[PDB]
Amino acid sequence: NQVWNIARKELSDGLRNRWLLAISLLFAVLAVGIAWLGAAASSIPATIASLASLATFLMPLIALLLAYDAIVGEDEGGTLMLLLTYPLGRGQILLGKFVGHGLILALAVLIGFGCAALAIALLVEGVELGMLFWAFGRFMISSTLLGWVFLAFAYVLSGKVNEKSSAAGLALGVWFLFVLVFDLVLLALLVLSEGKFNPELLPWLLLLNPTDIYRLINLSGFEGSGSAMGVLSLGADLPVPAAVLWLCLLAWIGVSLLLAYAIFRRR
């Protein structure tokens, strides 16, 4: 198949990016460092909300470092106009780039949360290995999905722009908006209205930010304190179950990938 033949390039091109391997080793040495500081103090709901906050800062960052120059980095490099004269479609060199860059994020978080599990089962003596494997299995198959959202965000903002210096400006803008601006606009909307703007709409505004849907999935079982949640304390007011929250994360991929394909189809 042609989708795997072009995925094998990006799998062998993203792993030679030295800027990736810096901040993918930074994700590994911080997930050990959070789990080691979480092991000497014990607690359990603080090491989940801090690991999910660590992957809130880095799994969008590795995704946007990979794929900001996926389409426009090939267009001004000349190798995109050549590739369309190969037996391919425009739908195969995007889905192929998504599979190729998607296996990097599936490996960049299997390194990170894999060594985080070995920094708990070899550190916390007498920990429940069944509860550890289940909780970090939910961390693995949902931080990829957060990574695949921002991977599909980067294909949207690469096909729309036509210069790579401006693609890095939009990829930095998307990383600032979804991670630490939407969490602060929602905070400032709640403080300045003193929680009396809307008592039913404001928990549904968490679904317009995939980093907040990501934090709500991993903080399902281990709620604990409210100050560890902060603005995520609105998630107790959401009447939606947990299974739809997986589906609302997958719908953030498929909407932002079909938008990435509809922009690329009229490139």
Partner 1 sequence: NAVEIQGVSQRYGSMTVLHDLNLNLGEGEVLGLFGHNGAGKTTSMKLILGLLSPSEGQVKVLGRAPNDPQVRRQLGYLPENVTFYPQLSGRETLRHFARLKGAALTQVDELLEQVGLAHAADRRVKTYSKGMRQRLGLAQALLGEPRLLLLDEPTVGLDPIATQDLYLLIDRLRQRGTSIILCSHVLPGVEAHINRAAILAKGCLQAVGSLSQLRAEAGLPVRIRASGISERDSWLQRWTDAGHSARGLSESSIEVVAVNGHKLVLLRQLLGEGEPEDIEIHQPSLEDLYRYYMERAGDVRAQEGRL
Partner 2 sequence: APQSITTLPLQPDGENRWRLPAGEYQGQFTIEQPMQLRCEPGAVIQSQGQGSSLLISAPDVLVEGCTLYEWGSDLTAMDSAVFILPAAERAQISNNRMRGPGFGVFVDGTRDVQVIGNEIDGDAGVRSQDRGNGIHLFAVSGARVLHNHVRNARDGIYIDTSNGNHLEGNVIEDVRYGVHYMFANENSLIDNVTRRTRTGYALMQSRKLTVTGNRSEQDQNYGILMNYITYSTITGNFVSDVQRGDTGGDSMISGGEGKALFIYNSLFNTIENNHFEKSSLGIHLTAGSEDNRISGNAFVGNQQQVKYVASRTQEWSVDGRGNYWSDYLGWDRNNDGLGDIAYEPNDNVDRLLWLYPQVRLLMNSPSIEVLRWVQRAFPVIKSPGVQDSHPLMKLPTEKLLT
CB of 109 to partner 2, least distance (A): 17
* Of residues 138 and 164, the one with the C-beta less far from partner 1: 164
> Which of these ranges, 18-26, 83-91, 99-107, 239-247, lies near its own copies under the rule CB under 8 A?
18-26
Residue 84 near partner 1 by CB under 8 A = yes
Residue 82 near partner 1 by CB under 8 A = yes
Could you say which of 40, 41, 78, 126 contacts partner 1 (CB under 8 A)?
78
Residue 12 contacts which entry, partner 2, partner 1, its own copies, none (Cβ below 5-8 A, type-dependent): partner 1
* Of residues 31 and 167, the one with the C-beta less far from partner 1: 167
Distances in whole angstroms, Cα of residue 94 to Cα of each of 73, 82, 89, 100, 264: 13, 15, 9, 10, 8
Distances in whole angstroms, Cα of residue 168 to Cα of each of 127, 154, 162, 253: 44, 10, 11, 21
Which residue is associated with the tokens 């969008």?
60
Binders of its own copies among residues 118 to 177 (CB under 8 A) are 166, 169
Residue 22 near its own copies by CB under 8 A = yes
Residue 114 near its own copies by CB under 8 A = no
> Which of these ranges, 6-14, 113-121, 155-163, 199-207, lies near partner 2 under the rule CB under 8 A?
199-207
CB of 122 to its own copies, least distance (A): 22
Interior angle at CA 104, CA 29 and CA 267, nearest 5: 135
Distance (Å, whole) CA 80 – CA 92: 13
Residue 19 near its own copies by CB under 8 A = yes
Residue 265 near partner 1 by CB under 8 A = no
Which two three-digit tokens encode residue 258?
């079909």
Query: For residue 112, with 0-12 CB atoms within 10 Å meaning exposed, 13-18 middle and 19 or more buried, which class applies?
Result: buried
Distance (Å, whole) CA 171 – CA 18: 18
Distance (Å, whole) CA 190 – CA 134: 34
For helices 129-159 and 92-121, the axis angle rounded to 10 degrees is: 150
Residue 77 near partner 1 by CB under 8 A = yes
Name the CA dihedral angle for 147, 152, 155, 157, rounded to a multiple of 10 degrees: -90
Distances in whole angstroms, Cα of residue 101 to Cα of each of 52, 89, 113, 129: 21, 18, 19, 31
Residue 266 contacts which entry, partner 2, partner 1, its own copies, none (Cβ below 5-8 A, type-dependent): none
CB of 162 to partner 2, least distance (A): 32
- Which residues form the interface with partner 1 (CB under 8 A)? 2, 5-6, 8-9, 12-13, 16-17, 77-79, 81-88
- Which residues form the interface with its own copies (CB under 8 A)? 18-19, 22, 166, 169
- Which residues form the interface with partner 2 (CB under 8 A)? 34, 37-38, 41, 46-47, 49-50, 52-54, 56-57, 179-184, 186-187, 190-191, 193-196, 199, 202-203, 206, 211-212, 215-216, 218-219, 225-230, 233-234, 237
